[PDB]
Amino acid sequence: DLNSVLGKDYGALKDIVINANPASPPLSLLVLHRLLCEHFRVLSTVHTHSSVKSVPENLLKCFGRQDYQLGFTLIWKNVPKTQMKFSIQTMCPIEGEGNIARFLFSLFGQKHNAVNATLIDSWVDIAIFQLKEGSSKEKAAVFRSMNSALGKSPWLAGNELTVADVVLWSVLQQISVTVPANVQRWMRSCENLAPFNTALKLLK
């Protein structure tokens, strides 16, 4: 797609600003950023906000021509949950890395029918609402679900990589392990990819 009809009354998208806590780096976002770069020309900058001291070096250099389509500013800041805004200032920022991930991936323009679009959403919801803070019983349940679906398809939501794959994979990395084989295979599928691969390195 590549269109810029994203905001109806305001101007087309140019700069995206994200606030993130450095005690809780958002691997999904780092990964997605790498992904966007392949398809878009991005100006990437990291700031640290007044309220933060000693952000680790890997975190500072996590992004390190004529014109840009997209501008990407990551601000390390003491926030409870990750935020996104499209201008220097705003009232209701979009909170939560799951929601930020859906939006960014969408800029690729790969449309889905109502059922697939909802399934993709549902997986993103599982990573955030269950797998992220879940009890082992909950974690086991999630693994089970993925394994079942990863025997149907090579990717969580179908034959193509979706934001479902990016988010749940990223969440997995930042949290007693017994892993089914479809999942263990799907992990490999992801790690093979450059964008997933490099970002993992940054968190060290």
Partner: protein, 168 residues
Amino acid sequence: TLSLTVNSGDPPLGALLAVEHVKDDVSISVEEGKENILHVSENVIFTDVNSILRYLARVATTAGLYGSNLMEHTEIDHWLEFSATKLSSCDSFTSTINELNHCLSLRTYLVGNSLSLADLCVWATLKGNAAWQEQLKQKKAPVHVKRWFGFLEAQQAFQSVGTKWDVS
């Protein structure tokens, strides 16, 4: 066609509000049960309220419950998580309520000046939250939410679903 089994114990008011707003537009039946399930085709189903809300709004094109652009799309998602986490919680209600209050300061509807998923899920949760009502008894509720809440509660659909489904 499209059938929804609800949990008649703790009804998903938000989803039922959703069904009512898409009826003319889509043919859908509701059945009583012990859990929430949306049956779409032979064996494709949705179980969690937020997945059911998203499918309904995606299929009910006329209703426009999912916004009109990617921006509003993302805003509506934000409110879906907001309701399913911060508001689906006892703790830090005050912090949460104030946040909602600030967002509604200059808005009539949560997203894009017209009714949306955001409005449904947040209102549904906000109803079923004890803290909200206690604030209501006390008269200590924040001003904007009170207006917005009141405005929605007075609409026909919000009272049809309330009358048929609200346990209290």
